[PDB]
Design a protein around this ligand. Structure first.
Ligand SMILES: NC(=O)C1=CN([C@@H]2O[C@H](COP(=O)(O)OP(=O)(O)OC[C@H]3O[C@@H](n4cnc5c(N)ncnc54)[C@H](OP(=O)(O)O)[C@@H]3O)[C@@H](O)[C@H]2O)C=CC1
Ligand SMILES: NC(=O)C1=CN([C@@H]2O[C@H](COP(=O)(O)OP(=O)(O)OC[C@H]3O[C@@H](n4cnc5c(N)ncnc54)[C@H](OP(=O)(O)O)[C@@H]3O)[C@@H](O)[C@H]2O)C=CC1
Ligand SMILES: COc1cc([C@@H]2OC[C@@H]3[C@H]2CO[C@H]3c2ccc(O)c(OC)c2)ccc1O
Ligand SMILES: COc1cc([C@@H]2OC[C@@H]3[C@H]2CO[C@H]3c2ccc(O)c(OC)c2)ccc1O
Lengths: 285, 285
């Protein structure tokens, strides 16, 4: 009990933040969630925060505009994980508090997407972490399955289309589709792993490196219906999100480099039986 | 299984609606959830909807602007429960027209779950329900605990204040504070109860009939801290939100008429061990 790693989760009601909270709990960490002052009446956010208490988490009230409150929060833990909307730069206030507190064994900033160093506020946050001497882990390299797999990678929707589907280019560019729950579980496992201190950890589970046509074909196999496919050229492709989609599906930024086993989450943590996309898609049938 | 009541929940990703979905499942009803077209990318809404399928619910796609899709949906069930946001209410007039044409529905519980509007959009929905001869149950008479108890009935916040509290009048007007989960469980139990056909069901669990001062004193006993109290007179209090608090806390509209055992949820369903407010408030300590 006294040898549990203590983790503060910042952004604990976010999409990835809420999963990190539960993953830290499931991993046995003594888990604390930053409780920011209310900005409005927001019942869903409040009930989510207090539901963590029933699971055994603690809430720590603090405000990013009150440096003392951040220092006091981080003094109660060994590791900080942030998962802010991308409010990336608000983490600079967090870095300053960590630097002053002095007790933090590791900081995991709000990454969980493309590696920005291969492409940013995130790099600005990385530079402050490193300048301060705060030990770090950067979790990168996967598309959230909810945002790119459940919709067969169509923009503007989160569910599989009924008959028509746009194919980017020839849909033969490899993409990394990972269940958000698995990203959170890999994060909970890696944050006190001595092997990943001051490392970038790539989330690239081998069987989930799929081209978009491969993903569409997983779905066509589950439904028994071929979809009507329209290919979109890079020029015709060139609104929120275009030019994330471009880098991913045309440039293949998630798969244009190899990753060693010592830096890849599914090899670092082989007991995590990550969700393959055929299983992920079954919920939509 | 063939003896299950089939229930369609309209508004199933809302605050009350999500609880009604789960309470209908926990009661053993064969549960359907209206799936409206996406109006945006909404990760939380989509994932809540599909999470119901893992619990055994089914999704029926329909749209309020497509009359025939609503007719198709309600023909698949026996009972419809609506819990739309408090325009939104008037959308139910479409639903009534679809239920009237479909002809198969045994009961419709419209979106009530608060002040009795017989004493306006809710009343207009009631009139259309009754004109169409659709059997109904109106579930009324309680303040959601999350909106009125966890904040000690202060406005603008959902958690207990740390030092100061506004008391409305002398704070000796009886209010009804009920955990939303209990409201949803009463709703699931009453929707096929022969005793409540064409009736109003008041959710007034006896030990949760409390003045604001009694609620504040419950909190002070749990915390051992006396709060600084400012009494706000009726005249000074004296907008829709303000009008709601005025009717509840100054006019006592939830408790000024007594209710018979045959029309009050806690007496009709005495097996529901409703959360008393001393237990409700403990999650905030
Ligand atoms: N396919 C992929 O790889 C994806 C990658 N990502 C990345 O994941 C990370 C998290 O994004 P996501 O989970 O969608 O985040 P969210 O939109 O869910 O927001 C997460 C948390 O941000 C906090 N927040 C927002 N604004 C502020 C603010 N001004 N001040 C203080 N706190 C604030 C809030 O914390 P609180 O809960 O305390 O209120 C919020 O809950 C991001 O880096 C994102 O780039 C996200 C989507 C897809
Ligand atoms: N203290 C009390 O007694 C309380 C009483 N209430 C009452 O409870 C009932 C539900 O309120 P609440 O739980 O807060 O509702 P919500 O605001 O949580 O929303 C409920 C559902 O409304 C549907 N909706 C909203 N607009 C539309 C629209 N134009 N067209 C179609 N569907 C729409 C959506 O359903 P979908 O899920 O399909 O997307 C939404 O999920 C109301 O009658 C309210 O007056 C509410 C608060 C406190
Ligand atoms: C995969 O790496 C990232 C992903 C994103 C995720 O693409 C930006 C976002 C996002 C997911 O939501 C994607 C998006 C933008 C516009 C859309 O219409 C969309 O539809 C699913 C999805 C954000 C930052 C990243 O580094
Ligand atoms: C019977 O109770 C009702 C409650 C409301 C709930 O009071 C109107 C609303 C609402 C909850 O959110 C309440 C509210 C409005 C403004 C606020 O500042 C507020 O702070 C908690 C709370 C809606 C309709 C009702 O019939």
């Amino acid at each position: 009990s006294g040898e549990k790693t203590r983790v503060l989760v910042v952004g604990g009601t976010g999409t990835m933040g809420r999963r990190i909270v539960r993953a830290c709990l499931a991993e046995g960490h003594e888990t604390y969630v930053l409780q920011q002052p209310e900005t409005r009446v927001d019942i869903e956010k409040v009930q989510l925060l207090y539901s963590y208490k029933r699971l055994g988490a603690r809430l720590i009230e603090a405000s990013f505009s009150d440096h003392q409150s951040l220092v006091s929060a981080v003094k109660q833990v060994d590791i900080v994980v942030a998962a802010m909307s991308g409010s990336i730069l608000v983490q600079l206030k967090l870095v300053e508090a960590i630097k002053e507190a002095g007790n933090i064994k590791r900081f995991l900033p709000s990454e969980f997407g493309m590696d920005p160093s291969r492409m940013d506020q995130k790099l600005e946050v990385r530079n402050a972490i490193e300048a301060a001497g705060i030990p770090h882990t950067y979790v990168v390299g996967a598309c959230f399955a909810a945002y790119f797999a459940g919709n067969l990678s169509q923009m503007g929707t989160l569910i599989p289309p009924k008959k028509k589907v746009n194919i980017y280019g020839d849909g033969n560019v490899k993409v990394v589709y990972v269940d958000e729950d698995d990203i959170a579980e890999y994060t909970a496992k890696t944050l006190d792993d001595p092997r990943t201190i001051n490392k970038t950890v790539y989330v690239r589970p081998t069987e989930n490196v799929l081209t978009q046509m491969e993903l569409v074909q997983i779905w066509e196999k589950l439904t028994g219906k071929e979809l009507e496919k329209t290919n979109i050229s890079a020029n015709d492709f060139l609104q929120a999100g275009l030019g994330h989609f471009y880098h991913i599906f045309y440039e293949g930024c998630l798969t244009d480099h190899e990753v060693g086993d010592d830096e890849e989450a599914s090899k670092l943590y082989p007991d995590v039986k990550y969700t393959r996309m055929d299983e992920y898609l079954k919920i939509f049938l």
